[PDB]
């Protein structure tokens, strides 16, 4: 992945979200997200509401076998949670960010590129990663699958 032209620093505006905040492994992540995103969409339907944008996930310590993950959908205000689905916010602050097109299994390429770009520009990372799944992977060709990848800055 080349960062020459498409990598940028973004100022992220926090907006309301419905989230699940839990922990997972890389093996179980796919099943976790299908289950939890389904459930969030059902809780939204459950109030006669829709998401306000594509779903996302936040990650820290992804090397560990088991790592924290927070994932969900941006929503209108006035939405309530239930069970383990909670109201919160999308990230705020600065991030080093790039659009990535391709299968998730090759996304480390953009991570490597962004960490090089961050080093070249003297920025500091918090260690948190933030992915926005602009396309649904079940319904999209892998060579067209869009994810925005952001590394949060310290
Ligand atoms: C852009 N919007 C509208 C969407 C909508 C749905 C998804 C689902 C999903 C939700 C429920 C059931 C199946 C899927 C699927 O498509 O497999 C995603 C599932 C997994 C995922 N990861 C990053 C592993 C990412 C997912 O992103 C999505 C994005």
mmCIF file of C-alpha atoms and ligand atoms in Angstrom:
data_model
loop_
_atom_site.group_PDB
_atom_site.id
_atom_site.type_symbol
_atom_site.label_atom_id
_atom_site.label_comp_id
_atom_site.label_asym_id
_atom_site.label_seq_id
_atom_site.Cartn_x
_atom_site.Cartn_y
_atom_site.Cartn_z
ATOM 1 C CA UNK A 1 0.000 0.000 0.000
ATOM 2 C CA UNK A 2 1.407 3.434 -0.874
ATOM 3 C CA UNK A 3 0.665 6.431 1.411
ATOM 4 C CA UNK A 4 2.103 9.047 -1.023
ATOM 5 C CA UNK A 5 -1.245 10.497 -2.078
ATOM 6 C CA UNK A 6 -4.250 9.207 -0.133
ATOM 7 C CA UNK A 7 -3.128 9.221 3.532
ATOM 8 C CA UNK A 8 -4.252 12.188 5.553
ATOM 9 C CA UNK A 9 -4.732 13.469 9.068
ATOM 10 C CA UNK A 10 -8.431 13.699 9.972
ATOM 11 C CA UNK A 11 -10.040 15.543 12.868
ATOM 12 C CA UNK A 12 -12.757 13.169 13.962
ATOM 13 C CA UNK A 13 -16.050 14.578 15.231
ATOM 14 C CA UNK A 14 -17.711 12.316 17.845
ATOM 15 C CA UNK A 15 -21.347 11.506 17.056
ATOM 16 C CA UNK A 16 -23.845 9.221 18.834
ATOM 17 C CA UNK A 17 -23.424 5.480 18.336
ATOM 18 C CA UNK A 18 -24.921 2.199 19.545
ATOM 19 C CA UNK A 19 -22.006 -0.054 20.533
ATOM 20 C CA UNK A 20 -21.074 -3.453 21.876
ATOM 21 C CA UNK A 21 -17.954 -3.266 24.050
ATOM 22 C CA UNK A 22 -16.343 -6.620 24.549
ATOM 23 C CA UNK A 23 -13.282 -8.739 23.734
ATOM 24 C CA UNK A 24 -12.554 -11.327 21.049
ATOM 25 C CA UNK A 25 -9.912 -13.270 19.127
ATOM 26 C CA UNK A 26 -9.089 -12.914 15.423
ATOM 27 C CA UNK A 27 -10.622 -16.379 14.834
ATOM 28 C CA UNK A 28 -13.949 -15.419 16.408
ATOM 29 C CA UNK A 29 -14.125 -11.768 15.264
ATOM 30 C CA UNK A 30 -16.155 -12.480 12.104
ATOM 31 C CA UNK A 31 -18.831 -14.448 13.982
ATOM 32 C CA UNK A 32 -18.876 -11.839 16.743
ATOM 33 C CA UNK A 33 -19.473 -8.974 14.274
ATOM 34 C CA UNK A 34 -22.196 -10.788 12.299
ATOM 35 C CA UNK A 35 -24.009 -11.554 15.563
ATOM 36 C CA UNK A 36 -23.581 -8.166 17.215
ATOM 37 C CA UNK A 37 -24.205 -6.012 14.150
ATOM 38 C CA UNK A 38 -27.360 -8.027 13.520
ATOM 39 C CA UNK A 39 -28.388 -7.422 17.130
ATOM 40 C CA UNK A 40 -27.671 -3.681 16.973
ATOM 41 C CA UNK A 41 -29.740 -3.398 13.813
ATOM 42 C CA UNK A 42 -32.523 -5.303 15.604
ATOM 43 C CA UNK A 43 -32.419 -3.003 18.624
ATOM 44 C CA UNK A 44 -32.655 -0.073 16.195
ATOM 45 C CA UNK A 45 -35.583 -1.612 14.297
ATOM 46 C CA UNK A 46 -36.908 -2.336 17.841
ATOM 47 C CA UNK A 47 -37.318 1.455 18.220
ATOM 48 C CA UNK A 48 -38.353 2.207 14.632
ATOM 49 C CA UNK A 49 -34.915 3.693 13.783
ATOM 50 C CA UNK A 50 -32.092 3.122 11.276
ATOM 51 C CA UNK A 51 -28.296 3.665 11.443
ATOM 52 C CA UNK A 52 -27.035 7.065 10.365
ATOM 53 C CA UNK A 53 -23.916 5.698 8.620
ATOM 54 C CA UNK A 54 -21.780 2.585 8.117
ATOM 55 C CA UNK A 55 -20.675 0.445 11.079
ATOM 56 C CA UNK A 56 -17.240 0.634 12.661
ATOM 57 C CA UNK A 57 -14.914 -1.026 15.163
ATOM 58 C CA UNK A 58 -12.178 0.175 17.511
ATOM 59 C CA UNK A 59 -9.222 -1.977 18.498
ATOM 60 C CA UNK A 60 -6.310 -1.886 20.882
ATOM 61 C CA UNK A 61 -3.670 -4.504 21.526
ATOM 62 C CA UNK A 62 -4.720 -6.569 18.472
ATOM 63 C CA UNK A 63 -1.501 -8.609 18.774
ATOM 64 C CA UNK A 64 -2.675 -10.414 21.945
ATOM 65 C CA UNK A 65 -4.613 -13.607 21.458
ATOM 66 C CA UNK A 66 -7.605 -11.980 23.136
ATOM 67 C CA UNK A 67 -8.089 -8.249 22.597
ATOM 68 C CA UNK A 68 -10.635 -5.571 23.367
ATOM 69 C CA UNK A 69 -13.032 -4.489 20.646
ATOM 70 C CA UNK A 70 -15.805 -1.896 20.545
ATOM 71 C CA UNK A 71 -18.059 -2.043 17.512
ATOM 72 C CA UNK A 72 -21.353 -0.603 16.391
ATOM 73 C CA UNK A 73 -23.210 1.906 14.244
ATOM 74 C CA UNK A 74 -23.563 5.692 14.313
ATOM 75 C CA UNK A 75 -27.178 6.595 15.096
ATOM 76 C CA UNK A 76 -29.440 9.589 15.628
ATOM 77 C CA UNK A 77 -29.622 10.987 19.135
ATOM 78 C CA UNK A 78 -32.581 9.848 21.178
ATOM 79 C CA UNK A 79 -31.803 6.191 20.511
ATOM 80 C CA UNK A 80 -31.549 3.996 23.582
ATOM 81 C CA UNK A 81 -29.608 0.809 24.207
ATOM 82 C CA UNK A 82 -30.508 -2.427 25.959
ATOM 83 C CA UNK A 83 -28.577 -5.367 27.353
ATOM 84 C CA UNK A 84 -24.939 -5.061 26.350
ATOM 85 C CA UNK A 85 -25.738 -2.652 23.473
ATOM 86 C CA UNK A 86 -24.992 0.817 24.837
ATOM 87 C CA UNK A 87 -25.142 4.429 23.731
ATOM 88 C CA UNK A 88 -21.749 6.030 23.299
ATOM 89 C CA UNK A 89 -19.874 8.124 20.762
ATOM 90 C CA UNK A 90 -17.655 7.567 17.726
ATOM 91 C CA UNK A 91 -14.010 8.547 18.175
ATOM 92 C CA UNK A 92 -12.839 12.078 18.686
ATOM 93 C CA UNK A 93 -9.469 13.586 18.043
ATOM 94 C CA UNK A 94 -6.872 13.354 15.342
ATOM 95 C CA UNK A 95 -6.170 10.222 13.354
ATOM 96 C CA UNK A 96 -3.874 9.149 10.529
ATOM 97 C CA UNK A 97 -6.352 7.777 8.012
ATOM 98 C CA UNK A 98 -6.526 6.068 4.611
ATOM 99 C CA UNK A 99 -9.166 4.388 2.506
ATOM 100 C CA UNK A 100 -8.392 0.715 1.752
ATOM 101 C CA UNK A 101 -10.052 -1.327 -1.012
ATOM 102 C CA UNK A 102 -9.728 -5.136 -0.840
ATOM 103 C CA UNK A 103 -10.302 -8.151 1.450
ATOM 104 C CA UNK A 104 -9.839 -7.719 5.199
ATOM 105 C CA UNK A 105 -7.235 -10.472 5.176
ATOM 106 C CA UNK A 106 -4.818 -8.149 3.354
ATOM 107 C CA UNK A 107 -5.573 -4.994 5.352
ATOM 108 C CA UNK A 108 -2.231 -5.138 7.232
ATOM 109 C CA UNK A 109 -0.767 -3.502 4.085
ATOM 110 C CA UNK A 110 -2.571 -0.223 4.885
ATOM 111 C CA UNK A 111 -1.591 -0.500 8.540
ATOM 112 C CA UNK A 112 2.077 -0.802 7.581
ATOM 113 C CA UNK A 113 1.749 2.151 5.199
ATOM 114 C CA UNK A 114 0.000 4.353 7.784
ATOM 115 C CA UNK A 115 2.530 3.564 10.507
ATOM 116 C CA UNK A 116 5.353 4.494 8.132
ATOM 117 C CA UNK A 117 3.587 7.750 7.215
ATOM 118 C CA UNK A 118 3.030 8.544 10.908
ATOM 119 C CA UNK A 119 6.729 8.007 11.598
ATOM 120 C CA UNK A 120 7.749 10.138 8.602
ATOM 121 C CA UNK A 121 5.562 13.042 9.788
ATOM 122 C CA UNK A 122 6.571 12.864 13.481
ATOM 123 C CA UNK A 123 3.148 11.993 14.836
ATOM 124 C CA UNK A 124 2.544 9.842 17.897
ATOM 125 C CA UNK A 125 0.068 6.978 18.073
ATOM 126 C CA UNK A 126 -2.219 6.192 21.004
ATOM 127 C CA UNK A 127 -2.226 2.516 19.978
ATOM 128 C CA UNK A 128 -5.935 2.590 19.074
ATOM 129 C CA UNK A 129 -7.124 1.599 15.580
ATOM 130 C CA UNK A 130 -10.465 2.612 14.110
ATOM 131 C CA UNK A 131 -12.019 0.900 11.091
ATOM 132 C CA UNK A 132 -15.176 2.005 9.241
ATOM 133 C CA UNK A 133 -16.787 -0.719 7.107
ATOM 134 C CA UNK A 134 -18.211 1.372 4.287
ATOM 135 C CA UNK A 135 -19.373 -1.753 2.412
ATOM 136 C CA UNK A 136 -21.023 -4.892 3.747
ATOM 137 C CA UNK A 137 -18.569 -7.765 3.140
ATOM 138 C CA UNK A 138 -21.273 -10.371 2.568
ATOM 139 C CA UNK A 139 -22.686 -8.300 -0.337
ATOM 140 C CA UNK A 140 -19.591 -6.734 -1.945
ATOM 141 C CA UNK A 141 -16.894 -8.056 -4.267
ATOM 142 C CA UNK A 142 -13.561 -8.281 -2.408
ATOM 143 C CA UNK A 143 -11.839 -6.101 -5.071
ATOM 144 C CA UNK A 144 -14.425 -3.395 -4.329
ATOM 145 C CA UNK A 145 -14.670 -3.800 -0.510
ATOM 146 C CA UNK A 146 -14.072 -0.374 1.103
ATOM 147 C CA UNK A 147 -12.769 0.111 4.675
ATOM 148 C CA UNK A 148 -11.474 3.389 6.068
ATOM 149 C CA UNK A 149 -8.558 2.611 8.404
ATOM 150 C CA UNK A 150 -7.537 5.224 10.982
ATOM 151 C CA UNK A 151 -4.782 5.131 13.623
ATOM 152 C CA UNK A 152 -5.624 7.453 16.517
ATOM 153 C CA UNK A 153 -2.981 9.999 17.408
ATOM 154 C CA UNK A 154 -1.712 10.880 20.904
HETATM 155 C C1 LIG B 1 -22.006 -0.849 5.251
HETATM 156 N N1 LIG B 1 -23.007 -1.562 6.022
HETATM 157 C C2 LIG B 1 -24.384 -1.152 5.802
HETATM 158 C C3 LIG B 1 -22.729 -2.782 6.576
HETATM 159 C C4 LIG B 1 -23.749 -3.690 6.856
HETATM 160 C C5 LIG B 1 -23.461 -4.936 7.392
HETATM 161 C C6 LIG B 1 -22.157 -5.325 7.669
HETATM 162 C C7 LIG B 1 -21.807 -6.581 8.221
HETATM 163 C C8 LIG B 1 -22.817 -7.668 8.436
HETATM 164 C C9 LIG B 1 -23.752 -7.498 9.463
HETATM 165 C C10 LIG B 1 -24.635 -8.518 9.770
HETATM 166 C C11 LIG B 1 -24.616 -9.704 9.053
HETATM 167 C C12 LIG B 1 -23.718 -9.881 8.012
HETATM 168 C C13 LIG B 1 -22.810 -8.871 7.696
HETATM 169 C C14 LIG B 1 -21.852 -9.127 6.584
HETATM 170 O O1 LIG B 1 -21.919 -8.275 5.600
HETATM 171 O O2 LIG B 1 -21.071 -10.075 6.606
HETATM 172 C C15 LIG B 1 -20.405 -6.846 8.574
HETATM 173 C C16 LIG B 1 -19.929 -8.038 9.115
HETATM 174 C C17 LIG B 1 -18.593 -8.191 9.446
HETATM 175 C C18 LIG B 1 -17.678 -7.150 9.231
HETATM 176 N N2 LIG B 1 -16.358 -7.308 9.503
HETATM 177 C C19 LIG B 1 -15.449 -6.170 9.468
HETATM 178 C C20 LIG B 1 -15.793 -8.592 9.908
HETATM 179 C C21 LIG B 1 -18.157 -5.955 8.680
HETATM 180 C C22 LIG B 1 -19.480 -5.825 8.351
HETATM 181 O O3 LIG B 1 -19.836 -4.624 7.775
HETATM 182 C C23 LIG B 1 -21.145 -4.382 7.436
HETATM 183 C C24 LIG B 1 -21.413 -3.148 6.886
#
